[PDB]
């Protein structure tokens, strides 16, 4: 009864606290710095054999191999440099949005209307890749999934709720339920020891893996959150939204630290991926291209435009050598 | 300039290629349709006619033609982000239960969402307008009358066009049309040659609804063969 | 992983014989295959290949016009008829299955191998010491020497190491000069320089005893070493 009044209190405190974190912005400490210029990245590779809209695509560790899932029910993993299809997953439900790369290369996960994180071994001796598992237990489409190891992944639903499963018995090691509307994104920490999440409900949520629990959450949106992706150090994430605007926070701070926008663009950002260092902050969007922003400056630095329809996923290689951009267009460009 | 090892996985690459090729020759003859529609409005009895689980598929033929239903059965109740994988889909199949006036406005609420829906611009709503013997029964009885949750039905009166070739109650008739019509004033209200509304009036057994999916689909796929050609 | 070699026996000099291979436990169709014969108390030679599909297939010189090699992928069985069987052609045929893609290990798993008895630019692969006898514990080093660079332009080197233990099928050690095949312990590193390279197995144990055989797989010919034999 009284508790809605503790939590307007408490909520108060809390920005309280982060006003009196904001000494200064980003923008005001980035000016002296020189400016990242104009970047112009071309299209190295063209990947042609999706039949429909690639919604999801995941780097290999090894910055070579490529898994993409296309809602034409088919994950292919593509060896990047050759654009040989190395292999092609028929999957059982063609409703998939998400699919992962493990970091050892053994596997891939996938997943999407089906409320449902296939896990594929890459790696059988039959020589043929079959579903090691079928994560069940979300009852919401599954958005994204991100392994932490050959046996632990984490995957965020529209059950307004993620899940830390352990892939050899099938179950929920742990979950997440702070969220009230569907989670679109999520993102592991360097170490492994956090991720961040967001959700419809436009805000973004750091998890402890661990301990299972919301340790901050961030609600400078004022749209629905469709990606989110963690600085190269762990201390910061950028959220992509519908709002048509990026947005890099702060753990340590634990607030906004910087707005990417610009007049030009209406359209809701679909994905978001740093480069290596973290300067550059590269964003897909409904408007079938992509924008390269000056992470600290804010400046848009570029623009990749060549896709013929709504860039789906986006996403740099551990090495940062390339940029890979899937589309609905039912494409895949690497560039560089 | 490449190994005998490269040349044998670019051999792989061209036999993954022409598996796909395989697959997409079947992609393109499927027709992919979405069926929406609340829980009263007994799409579920559609489904069986015509033949956790985030979504259920359904496969039927019309005319050698292949048919691919999805019925998103498992989903919070909140559409504005899964609905986007259902774009170009060949139709949206949309079911309403015409007999329960009490959700008629909330059932075209939801109709005039899935129509105002930016990414379903291009798709086209096949109206499966159900339940008819029970609004026909309803309407017969006079115990309630649309009027008293739609005024207009007071002032609305049987276009000269209406249709109806098996003989039944003039005022069965007037509630169905006046129906047909409140559905279709959102269709055309806004979206108009991006995207059409098939209206239907089926009961909870018909066997031929999937016949009726199968011409909106034919009519669906002239239109885009049409827009193609500048022909419209 | 089930590759049983069949036929074979004893031919008449210029007759003919078709040697069958069985393949079970694997998705034969997507693997390339090899026949690899090996002559009574001598080293493998490459025989024939056919790729995954039935394209790029491969004879050895000294069968090719002889040797045919196929495949049934519906039964997974390969075949290699011989026309005119030769004494040369007297050997122990092997079945090697081999899938070629980014990051893949051909030559991985060979067959029990069937015996067959009649009554100048390849790469040579030379191996210093056909025989280094040595005791369990101890680290001991293999070598090989490639008349041509085994490194492409790719970055890769084509080198792969095979045990042969007393009475049983050859087995994939390394793959790529470095590469440590599936279910190979730790104890075997293979290292090289572009043109000479180097098997170390560091705790050799009793199941290590054998004839360790070298093979390039820069060109076709696919060329095997004469085989460095270990004995304690």
């Known amino acids: 009864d009284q508790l809605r009044q503790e939590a307007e209190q408490l909520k108060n405190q809390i920005r309280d606290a982060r006003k009196a974190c904001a000494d200064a912005t980003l923008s005001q400490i980035t000016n002296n710095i020189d400016p990242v210029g104009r970047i112009q990245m071309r299209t190295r590779r063209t990947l042609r054999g999706h039949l429909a809209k690639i919604y999801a695509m995941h780097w290999g560790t090894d910055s070579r191999l490529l898994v993409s899932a296309s809602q034409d029910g088919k994950l292919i993993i593509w060896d990047s440099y050759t654009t040989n299809k190395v292999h092609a997953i028929p999957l059982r439900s063609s409703w998939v949005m998400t699919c992962a790369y493990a970091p050892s290369g053994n596997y891939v996960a996938c997943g999407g209307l089906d409320n449902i994180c296939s896990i594929y071994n890459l790696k059988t001796r039959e020589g043929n890749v079959r579903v090691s598992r079928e994560l069940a237990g979300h009852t919401g489409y599954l958005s994204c999934c991100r392994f932490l190891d050959d046996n632990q992944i984490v995957t965020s639903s529209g059950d307004t709720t993620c899940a830390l499963w352990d892939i050899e018995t099938g179950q929920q090691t742990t979950t997440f339920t702070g969220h009230t509307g569907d989670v679109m994104s999520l993102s592991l920490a360097p170490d492994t020891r956090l991720f961040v999440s967001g959700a419809c409900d436009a805000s973004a949520k750091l998890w402890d893996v661990r301990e299972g629990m919301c340790r901050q959450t961030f609600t400078g949106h004022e749209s629905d959150i469709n990606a989110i992706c963690f600085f190269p150090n762990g201390n910061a994430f950028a959220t992509g939204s519908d709002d048509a605007t990026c947005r890099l926070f702060d753990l340590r701070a634990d607030q906004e630290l910087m707005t990417y926008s610009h007049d030009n663009i209406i359209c809701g950002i679909t994905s978001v991926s740093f480069s290596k260092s973290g300067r550059l902050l590269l964003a897909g969007y409904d408007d079938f291209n992509c924008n390269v922003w000056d992470a600290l400056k804010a400046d848009r630095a570029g623009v990749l435009a060549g896709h013929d329809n709504r860039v789906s996923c986006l996403g740099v290689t551990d090495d940062g050598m390339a940029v890979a951009t899937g589309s609905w267009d039912s494409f895949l460009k690497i560039w560089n | 300039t490449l190994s005998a090892e490269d040349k044998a996985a670019v051999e792989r690459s061209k036999m993954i290629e022409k598996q796909l090729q395989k697959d997409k020759q079947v992609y393109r003859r499927t027709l992919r349709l979405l069926l929406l529609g609340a829980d009263n409005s007994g799409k579920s009895t559609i489904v069986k006619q015509m033949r956790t689980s985030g979504i259920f598929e359904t496969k039927f033929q019309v005319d050698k033609v292949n048919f691919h239903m999805f019925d998103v059965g498992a989903q919070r109740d909140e559409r504005r982000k899964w609905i986007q994988c259902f774009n170009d889909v060949t139709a949206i199949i949309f079911v309403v239960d015409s007999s329960d006036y009490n959700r008629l406005q909330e059932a075209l609420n939801d109709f005039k969402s899935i129509w105002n829906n930016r990414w379903l611009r291009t798709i086209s709503v096949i109206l499966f307008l159900n339940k008819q013997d029970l609004l026909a029964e309803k309407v017969l009885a006079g115990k309630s009358k649309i009027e008293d949750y739609f005024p207009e039905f007071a002032r609305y009166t049987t276009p000269e066009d209406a249709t109806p070739e098996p003989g039944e109650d003039p005022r069965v008739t007037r509630a169905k049309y006046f129906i047909r019509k409140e559905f279709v004033d959102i269709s055309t209200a806004s979206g108009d040659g991006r995207h059409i509304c098939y209206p239907h009036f089926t009961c909870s057994v018909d066997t031929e609804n999937a016949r009726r999916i199968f011409n909106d689909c034919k009519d669906i796929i002239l239109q885009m063969n049409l827009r193609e050609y500048n022909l419209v | 992983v089930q590759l049983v070699e069949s036929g074979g026996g004893l031919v008449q000099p210029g007759g003919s014989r078709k040697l069958s291979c069985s393949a079970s436990g694997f998705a034969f169709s997507s693997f390339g295959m090899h026949w690899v014969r090996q002559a009574p108390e001598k080293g493998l030679e490459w025989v024939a290949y056919?790729?995954?599909?039935?394209?790029?297939?491969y004879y050895a010189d000294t069968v090719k016009g002889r040797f045919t090699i196929s495949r049934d992928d519906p039964k997974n069985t390969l075949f290699l008829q011989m026309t005119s069987l030769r004494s040369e052609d007297t050997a122990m045929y092997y079945c090697?299955?081999?899938?070629?893609?980014?990051?893949?290990?051909?030559?991985?798993?060979w067959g029990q191998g069937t015996t067959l008895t009649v009554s100048s630019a390849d790469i040579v692969m030379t191996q210093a010491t056909s025989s280094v006898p040595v005791t369990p514990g101890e680290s001991v080093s293999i070598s090989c020497r490639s008349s041509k660079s085994l490194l492409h332009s790719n970055g890769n080197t084509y080198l792969y190491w095979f045990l042969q233990r007393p009475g049983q099928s050859p087995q994939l050690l390394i793959y790529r000069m470095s590469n440590l095949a599936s279910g190979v312990p730790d104890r075997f590193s293979g290292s090289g320089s572009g043109t000479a390279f180097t098997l170390t197995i560091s705790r050799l144990e009793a199941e290590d005893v054998g004839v360790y055989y070298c093979?390039?797989?820069?060109?076709?010919?696919?060329?095997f070493g004469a085989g460095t034999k270990l004995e304690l």
């Open positions: 093979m390039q797989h820069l060109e076709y010919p696919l060329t």
């Open positions: 090697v299955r081999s899938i070629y893609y980014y990051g893949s290990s051909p030559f991985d798993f």
């Open positions: 056919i790729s995954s599909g039935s394209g790029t297939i």
